[PDB]
Every structure is written in structure tokens, then in C-alpha cells.
Amino acid sequence: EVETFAFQAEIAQLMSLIINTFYSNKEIFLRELISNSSDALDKIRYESLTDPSKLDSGKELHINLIPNKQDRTLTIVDTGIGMTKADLINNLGTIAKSGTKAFMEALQAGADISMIGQFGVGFYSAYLVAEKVTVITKHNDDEQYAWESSAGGSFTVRTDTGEPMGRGTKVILHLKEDQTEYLEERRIKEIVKKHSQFIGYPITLFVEK
Ligand SMILES: OCc1cccc(N2CCCC2)n1
Numbered sequence: 001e002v003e004t005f006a007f008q009a010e011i012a013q014l015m016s017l018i019i020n021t022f023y024s025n026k027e028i029f030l031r032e033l034i035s036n037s038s039d040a041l042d043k044i045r046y047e048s049l050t051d052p053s054k055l056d057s058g059k060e061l062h063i064n065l066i067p068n069k070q071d072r073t074l075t076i077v078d079t080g081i082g083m084t085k086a087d088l089i090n091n092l093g094t095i096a097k098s099g100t101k102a103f104m105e106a107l108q109a110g111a112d113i114s115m116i117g118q119f120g121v122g123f124y125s126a127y128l129v130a131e132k133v134t135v136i137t138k139h140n141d142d143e144q145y146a147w148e149s150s151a152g153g154s155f156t157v158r159t160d161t162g163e164p165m166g167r168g169t170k171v172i173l174h175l176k177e178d179q180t181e182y183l184e185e186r187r188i189k190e191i192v193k194k195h196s197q198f199i200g201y202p203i204t205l206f207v208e209k
Pocket residue numbers: 036088092093096120121122123124135147
């Protein structure tokens with residue numbers, strides 16, 4: 001059972017700008033997604049201080065980067081707080097409405113796309129390199145869900161039946177045909193060293209078979 005939702009007009013407009021604006025510094029997508037993972041891990045670590053049982057779904061707080069040349073996918077896995085169904089459908093887009101308006105006014109005032117993180121909508125930078133994005137997420141208070149969008153103004157949400165995750169978020173980037181450089185180990189290493197060297201969680205870059 002797959003539910004289809006329309007993006008808010010502002011979010012759909014933001015995704016279209018990201019996809020259609022000529023902008024060569026696409027590598028900032030990884031910094032934005034790692035930053036999102038670090039924030040999600042900060043939240044579950046803080047919540048577990050006053051409630052240790054919140055880590056029953058997993059004590060390890062880490063980030064994994066998994067490239068797959070056969071599927072042409074780059075997966076960013078974290079064991080952070082995860083996202084509920086209400087987050088995927090309502091809460092995140094509601095928060096992102098103000099940030100999108102501020103971001104686009106800034107772009108008209110001379111800012112560039114790499115500053116998208118300062119407006120709270122860095123997740124959508126994934127569409128600089130991905131034609132489709134799948135998000136598998138599990139929050140302690142909800143079920144495991146699969147969020148998916150190839151842009152175009154709509155996204156889907158379903159209950160995920162795949163391998164259980166315990167807790168956290170998995171962002172699967174189905175890369176565009178000309179963006180396969182972000183599957184190479186040397187390239188991912190360079191980006192992490194350049195933009196995410198001081199993230200306070202272990203980042204493990206998986207290598208390919
Ligand atoms: O709206 C902004 C935003 C920030 C972080 C994550 C996110 N997601 C949309 C659904 C998948 C996850 N959106």
C-alpha cells in the first residue's frame with residue numbers, strides 16, 4: 001500500500017531550482033546529508049541522557065557511506081533518532097517552508113546553492129546528483145517507513161518490509177548517469193576530508209567488492 005502526496009508548492013519550486021539551475025559545485029550534497037545525520041545522532045544521544053532505554057534499538061552512533069556501482073547508488077546510513085510518519089508527511093515540509101522562502105530570497109540577493117544548509121533545507125541538495133532519492137527511516141515511536149521521490153512535484157510513503165533497521169535513517173541516492181564520480185572511494189574520501197572532517201561521529205566509508 002503506497003500513498004502518494006504532493007509537495008507543497010514552495011518545496012516543489014525549490015526542488016526544480018536545484019535540478020535545473022546550472023551549478024557545478026554539486027559535491028556539497030554529501031556535506032549536507034552528513035550534517036543532517038550528525039544532527040539526528042545528536043538528538044538521540046541527548047534524549048538518551050534522561051532516558052537510557054531509548055538506545056535499546058541500538059547503542060552505536062555512527063555514519064556509514066556505502067557506494068554501489070552495480071545499482072548506481074550512494075547510501076548514507078546513520079543510527080540517529082529517525083523520523084516518524086508525521087515527520088515525513090507533515091512536520092519536515094512545514095518547517096522547510098520558511099527556510100525555502102528565505103533561501104530563495106537569498107539566492108536572488110547573490111547567495112549561491114552551497115549555502116542551502118544555513119536555511120534548514122540541505123536535504124534537497126541530494127537532487128544535485130540523484131535522479132531519485134529513497135529514505136528508509138525508523139523512529140523509536142513509529143514503524144519503519146520508506147519515503148521516495150523522483151521530484152516532479154510528488155513523493156510516496158509506505159511501510160517498509162525490507163531488512164529492519166533498529167533505529168535511524170538511510171538515504172539512498174539513485175545517482176544521475178553523469179554523477180557516478182561520487183561512487184569512487186578516492187572522490188568520497190576527498191569530499192569528507194574537505195567538508196566533514198570534524199563531525200563528532202565515526203564515518204566509515206565502505207569500499208566495493
Ligand atoms: O523538509 C526538509 C527536510 C530536512 C531533512 C529531511 C527531510 N526529509 C524529507 C522526507 C525525507 C527526509 N526534509
